[PDB]
């Protein structure tokens, strides 16, 4: 169940991490 | 098998829903091509093709919704129709590829914008036929001839008085429908040509099209008597359609309120196509391709219908909103 | 050979169509996300240079989209044309998702068309973010629903076989099969990634040559970081899907990694050369991964290929694709991991060509890895369809049509790709 669900989670995380770049080291840096 | 008749019943109206917009686009990218063959202006092609293409995008949605829907209710078509219709498909797809390729390249390519309108002249007309071959054969035969089914030379079934009847049932009505839609919102002083060409194509409709509606009847007497009988049992719909055509023609001759010309046109070729379908039903060319053969699981029929609803529920309001962005008058 | 040539010619043609389709697709999947993010950054940061890159991208996203569409239609139609007896059974089950793909595409296409034709009319940037959110959602929704087809093709069920006739169909069982998660996930990740490196391969081209630091450094700085993330996630869901394979369909994986023999601790391979008939040449291999931190037990016994019937095994020229795909994965992740790190937040190596070159190669490498990967996952598949589904050898139709239509289409696609590339460069050189 955990490893059947996990992928889409990993994805969903990567997405909002990819967003979070735009706030962390884009807006308030470099 | 009720759901299996409802499915085809709706998908036929997906094919019609395609015919509607495809008529407008394929009339446009052809009439406009000739009218701008004289003076290939990149300003005018830019201003035109900034808004023409979206329609052509919307078309393929109808087309593919139909194409993908039909096989959900009838995989046996995907067997037979698929296995038979080997060549016309690829051609139609080449023509589409050409259409779209240049629809795209023209957007940011003035070199193609002027020279590859040739391609729209070609495809904008060639496509209607390339579909009309399958629409034809769908009421014809690959190993289905008279006395008890003789194997047919598919290479020589091209040239026939029933196929060109469908080519006329299409092309001329593409011309006419397109012309009517163009006329409807012809909010200009230069709209006199549109109504003259629309008159020519209306006369083509009363002639070649409604002619072909009878060429089919007088081909079926010698070909498929059951279909002939059904078509006589729904000839009153072709009458209704002719009357609606007469209404659109009246609006042509007289008033500026062409909304009723569009509604009358809509119901006109809607019923002229819907009867043309109904008569063919309930079956799909073969006695093995009758709606209830190869009985499928009917839950995904309901799901597919839900998907068709979800589809139309965008396809229609896309256009209803497309006709409110050009107004903002409510 | 009047109904057996096509068994090969069809496969060949379909490859030639879809191989083209994907170039103009994963872009369609990944770009809109990137555009949304660029808009969002521009908005949140009040920097109306990102907001210019959103549209600067969109303006070609269109052309990509259209070429995608026609190739889409092509394959769509080719589907039941080249493989009738397939759809004769499975069409009932595939019908829906396939539809939902293009439905999701039209749903995104509306809002795409709105943003495209309201950003130059109506008010405020947020109200154009809210129009670009549904787009990327609809894009990934396409991938979700369409991949569910391949996921299903790889694995049942949601059906029953009445002496060959496929009935008793459950939608979501067939759609949400065991493969669906890893397919959807890996495909979405390795498509955000790809386009993420593709935009970096523009920013690194334009910044390298006519160094307009202006957009082109910001572009790189964002695209590279997001690319890193997406490659990481991609690689993760890669390990995940690999484990899925090891568990559920080791026929592919054992052919990818050449594990003829079943063992507990079974080494992976970096690259080798076994010509189809046991000819082990180059041999560079490491101990086992998809057991130690995947199964949490290193001695998890991996199924061997010998234990799969040789009428049920796929080729051995699959390994090369795993090599390609994975190594591109890692390499490209490293390039990405360094760029932002070393070349910005350390020793200012951005302006060095030593990066800009690699970052120009970046996207193309990813697309390559895409094609490769699809070849890997799909070619490990050829000898199963002939069993639990239906004989691949009895899925095609006729020969002397396919051979020619294949070449017609070949030409056509050749023209498409070239022309599209040309126009899609011309636009960027016009600088709108
Ligand atoms: C050379 C490699 C190759 C070969 C021999 C094939 N394909 Fe393919 N296929 C891929 C390479 C590929 C691809 C061209 O790279 C695709 C196209 C869509 C994609 O993402 O990868 C892939 C994906 C793909 C999908 C993806 C569905 C989705 O995820 O949305 C379907 C349904 C098929 N193919 C169908 C077939 C069938 C029925 C084949 C008959 C044997 C076939 N492919 C041969
Ligand atoms: C994930 C990846 C992918 C894939 C795999 C696929 C796979 C596929 N596909 Fe795809 N698409 C896509 C991505 C995709 N796709 C997209 C993105 C789109 C949008 C546009 C472009 O392309 O760009 C489409 C679009 C499209 C289309 C169009 C629609 C309209 O026009 O409306 C079609 C028809 C198709 C088909 C198809 C098929 C048949 C297949 C096989 C199954 N498509
Ligand atoms: C592009 C980029 C990329 C990348 C980087 C990658 C990276 C990777 N990967 Fe990958 N893939 C891909 C792209 C890719 N990929 C693809 C495209 C494919 C096909 C489709 C699917 O997903 O299936 C694959 C597929 C795949 C598979 C199969 C699946 C199935 O069949 O189900 C596997 C196992 C893997 C693993 C992996 C890994 C481990 C890694 C680490 C590095 N893949």
Short mmCIF file of C-alpha atoms in Angstrom, two decimals, chain B residues 165 168-174 176 201-216 268-269 272:
data_model
loop_
_atom_site.label_atom_id
_atom_site.label_comp_id
_atom_site.label_asym_id
_atom_site.label_seq_id
_atom_site.Cartn_x
_atom_site.Cartn_y
_atom_site.Cartn_z
CA UNK B 165 -23.44 11.58 -53.88
CA UNK B 168 -21.79 16.23 -52.73
CA UNK B 169 -23.78 15.59 -49.52
CA UNK B 170 -20.59 16.87 -47.84
CA UNK B 171 -18.62 19.43 -49.91
CA UNK B 172 -21.50 21.63 -51.10
CA UNK B 173 -23.09 21.63 -47.63
CA UNK B 174 -19.68 22.46 -46.08
CA UNK B 176 -23.29 26.35 -47.65
CA UNK B 201 -24.23 27.21 -52.17
CA UNK B 202 -27.86 27.28 -51.02
CA UNK B 203 -28.83 26.47 -54.61
CA UNK B 204 -26.13 23.76 -54.43
CA UNK B 205 -27.88 22.57 -51.24
CA UNK B 206 -31.34 22.51 -52.85
CA UNK B 207 -29.60 20.87 -55.82
CA UNK B 208 -26.52 18.62 -55.33
CA UNK B 209 -27.09 18.03 -51.59
CA UNK B 210 -30.87 17.47 -51.43
CA UNK B 211 -30.33 15.90 -54.88
CA UNK B 212 -27.87 13.46 -53.30
CA UNK B 213 -30.33 12.84 -50.44
CA UNK B 214 -32.36 11.32 -53.30
CA UNK B 215 -29.35 9.85 -55.22
CA UNK B 216 -28.81 7.81 -52.08
CA UNK B 268 -32.02 21.61 -41.22
CA UNK B 269 -28.77 19.73 -41.70
CA UNK B 272 -30.94 15.89 -42.81
#
